[PDB]
Amino acid sequence: DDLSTAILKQKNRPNRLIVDEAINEDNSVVSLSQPKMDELQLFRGDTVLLKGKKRREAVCIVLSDDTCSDEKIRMNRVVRNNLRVRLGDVISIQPCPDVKYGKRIHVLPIDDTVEGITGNLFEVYLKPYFLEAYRPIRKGDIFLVRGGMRAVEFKVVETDPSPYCIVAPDTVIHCEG
Amino acid sequence: AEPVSKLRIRTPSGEFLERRFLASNKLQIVFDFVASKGFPWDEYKLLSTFPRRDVTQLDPNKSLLEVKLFPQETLFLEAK
Ligand SMILES: [Cl-]
């Protein structure tokens, strides 16, 4: 269950991996070696559930990486931050076939000042971010979107189904706020 | 084993199609597969997400190997 729990007498856990730097700077992506993916029966593009410190969780898409060590997982700063981990920390990864196309999500900019200072947030940030990307997201995520001429961080307030979903073309996106 | 591409394809409703193709198969063989399941070329695109690209927008005569769909990929059917 927890990263922080174990029984004394236990078959080892191949799904505990050491956090390493991303080469792919995408918020939705984590990378494993192909042998580690084979061992975990993970398929390229599968949605996965990651567990970090302080019972934080994240959902990502898993890709193979030929430079990744078998025991390591590459992830970007945004995912590290959502998991409350640092490089060299341990996370757990598990298959997450439970993820459905979402009916609606509710997000908001965590900075109260940005909307006034930039271009339309849906058109300049959210749409380009999610469009044709089929990203998994989880309630509580803070994610960073690089649009226009400055990045804007968004928090996921809620998803339907809860607490995670894939943002599909017919997913209703509510930003307020 | 002679190179195979396993493709998992999300339908518009979010469930899956799955099929293994020889990697030397023409991309046309994949178009034909989704069409046979109810998703004809003129109604649906077939997307990959890393990188984001429109697979249906590729040369149907090229092989899966040629077009970089190998050995595993998750694709997405999306109404045109
Ligand atoms: Cl909502």
UniProtKB/Swiss-Prot annotation, chain A:
Effect of residue 88 to E: In CMT2Y; increased ATPase activity
Reported effect, residue 146 to H: In FTDALS6 and IBMPFD1; properly assembles into a hexameric structure; cultured cells expressing the mutant protein show a marked general increase in the level of ubiquitin-conjugated proteins and impaired protein degradation through the endoplasmic reticulum-associated degradation (ERAD) pathway; shows strongly reduced affinity for ADP and increased affinity for ATP; shows normal ATPase activity according to PubMed:16321991 while according to PubMed:25878907 and PubMed:25125609 shows increased ATPase activity; no defect in ubiquitin-dependent protein degradation by the proteasome; impaired autophagic function; defective maturation of ubiquitin-containing autophagosomes; decreased interaction with CAV1 and UBXN6; decreased endosome to lysosome transport via multivesicular body sorting pathway of CAV1; decreases the arsenite-induced stress granules (SGs) clearance process
Phosphoserine: residues carrying this PTM: 4, 28
Zinc recorded as keyword: no
PTM remark: Phosphorylated by tyrosine kinases in response to T-cell antigen receptor activation. Phosphorylated in mitotic cells. ISGylated.
Keyword annotations of the record: Acetylation, Amyotrophic lateral sclerosis, ATP-binding, Autophagy, Charcot-Marie-Tooth disease, Cytoplasm, Disease variant, DNA damage, DNA repair, Endoplasmic reticulum, Hydrolase, Isopeptide bond, Lipid-binding, Methylation, Neurodegeneration, Neuropathy, Nucleotide-binding, Nucleus, Phosphoprotein, Transport, Ubl conjugation, Ubl conjugation pathway
One Gene Ontology MF term: ATP binding
Annotated localization: Cytoplasm, Cytosol; Endoplasmic reticulum; Nucleus; Cytoplasm, Stress granule
GO cellular component: ATPase complex; azurophil granule lumen; ciliary basal body; cytoplasm; cytoplasmic stress granule; cytosol; Derlin-1 retrotranslocation complex; endoplasmic reticulum
Cross-link (Glycyl lysine isopeptide (Lys-Gly) (interchain with G-Cter in SUMO2)) at residue(s): 9
Domain notes: The PIM (PUB-interaction motif) motif mediates interaction with the PUB domain of RNF31.
Annotated function: Necessary for the fragmentation of Golgi stacks during mitosis and for their reassembly after mitosis. Involved in the formation of the transitional endoplasmic reticulum (tER). The transfer of membranes from the endoplasmic reticulum to the Golgi apparatus occurs via 50-70 nm transition vesicles which derive from part-rough, part-smooth transitional elements of the endoplasmic reticulum (tER). Vesicle budding from the tER is an ATP-dependent process.
Similarity comment: family membership: Belongs to the AAA ATPase family.
Protein name as it appears in the record: Transitional endoplasmic reticulum ATPase
Section of the entire sequence shown: 10 to 186 of 806
UniProtKB/Swiss-Prot annotation, chain B:
Residues with PTM Phosphothreonine: 11
Chain positions found as Phosphoserine: 13
Organ and tissue specificity: Most abundant in testis, slightly less abundant in skeletal muscle and heart, followed by prostate, thymus, ovary, small intestine, and colon. Not detected in the peripheral blood leukocytes.
Domain UBX residues, every copy: 1-77
Intracellular or extracellular location(s): Nucleus
Function, as annotated: Ubiquitin-binding protein. Required for the progression of DNA replication forks by targeting DNA replication licensing factor CDT1 for degradation. Potentiates but cannot initiate FAS-induced apoptosis.
Quaternary context: Interacts with CDT1 and ATPase VCP/p97. Interacts (via UBA domain) with FAS (via death domain). Interacts (via UBA domain) with NLRP12 (via DAPIN/PYRIN domain).
Protein name, per record: FAS-associated factor 1
Primary gene name: FAF1
